[PDB]
Structure 1
Amino acid sequence: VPTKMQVTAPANISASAQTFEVACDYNGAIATLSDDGDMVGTAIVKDGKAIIKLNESIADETNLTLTVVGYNKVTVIKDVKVEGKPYTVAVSGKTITVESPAAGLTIFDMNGRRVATAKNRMVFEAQNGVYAVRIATEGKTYTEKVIVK
C-alpha cells in the first residue's frame, strides 16, 4: 500500500514565468507541469524542493496541472491557474492582428516575455517564431498560440 507525501506549491503562476518551485518532503519525487499531456517542464525533488525550469512559454495556457510522483507514494495533483468566440487573432507574414472590442490584449514571445499590450485592437510586427496571445474580456480570458514564419 503506498504512503502519503507532503507537497506545497503555489496556486497560480505568471504567464511570463520561467520556473515554478514545488516543496516536497520526499526527496527524489518527480514534479511535472503539463497541459493535458503536453509536459511543459519537470524536475526532481532535491533537498526538499523541485525547481521546475519551463521548457517552453506557458503564456498560451490558462491552467496547468502539477503532478508529483514518488516511488511507493500516492501521486499528488494540483491545478495551477496561469495569469497574465468574441475575438480574432490573425497572422499575415510577420504581422499579428488581434481584435476584441472592450478586451485587454497581450502578446508574449517564445521566452514568455510580454511584447505587446493594447485595448480592443492591435497590429503587432513580429519576428519568426511562436507567440502567445491572451484576450481578457470581462468574465473570461482566451488564448491562442501563433506561428510567425
Structure 2
Amino acid sequence: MAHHHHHHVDDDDKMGTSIADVANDKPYTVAVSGKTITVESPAAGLTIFDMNGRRVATAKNRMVFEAQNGVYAVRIATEGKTYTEKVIVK
C-alpha cells in the first residue's frame, strides 16, 4: 500500500504512546475499571492503603481488588525509585 503509510511502534523506547509521549517509560502500569483496581509492575512490592492510610490490601507484581467508593493510595516500590499513586473511585 503506497497510498498510505502506518507507523507501528516497537519495544525499546516507545516511539509514540496515547498517554503522554514524554511519560510512557514508567516501570509500572496503573489501570482502574469502575470498582476494580489493577496495578502491574514487573518485580515490585505493591501495597494499597485506604483513606485512613491503613493497609487494606497487599500483593506483588500484579494486583486486583474490588474496592468501593473512597480514596486510596497504591505504593509501587520498584528497584530504584519508590512511586506512590492514588486511586480515587467515585
When normalised by structure 2's length, the TM-score is 0.68
User: For 2:85 and 2:54, how far apart are their aligned partners in 1?
Assistant: 16
> 1:21-56: per-residue Cα shift (whole Å, max 9, x none)?
xxxxxxxxxxxxxxxxx99999xxxxxxxxxxxxxx
Structure 1: segments with no counterpart, 5+ residues: 1-37, 43-56, 61-81
Structure 2: segments with no counterpart, 5+ residues: 1-12
User: For 1:130 and 1:83, how far apart are their aligned partners in 2?
Assistant: 25
> 1:75-105: per-residue Cα shift (whole Å, max 9, x none)?
xxxxxxx999111121111111000010001
Say whether the 8 Å CA contact 2:14–2:25 is kept in structure 1: no
The equivalent position to 2:49 in structure 1, one of 92, 108, 122, is 108
Q: Which has the larger radius of gyration?
A: 1
Evaluate the alpha carbon distance shift between residue 103 and residue 121 of structure 1 in structure 2; reply closer, same or farther with a 3 A threshold. same
Runs of 4+ in 1 over 2 A off after TM superposition: 38-42, 57-60
The structural deviation recorded for 1:143 is 1.1
For residue 72 of structure 2, give the secondary structure of its aligned residue in structure 1.
strand
Evaluate the alpha carbon distance shift between residue 59 and residue 94 of structure 1 in structure 2; reply closer, same or farther with a 3 A threshold. farther
- Between stretches 100-109 and 135-144, larger displacement belongs to 135-144
Evaluate the alpha carbon distance shift between residue 130 and residue 40 of structure 1 in structure 2; reply closer, same or farther with a 3 A threshold. farther
User: For 1:104 and 1:138, how far apart are their aligned partners in 2?
Assistant: 9
Aligned Cα root-mean-square deviation (Å): 9.3
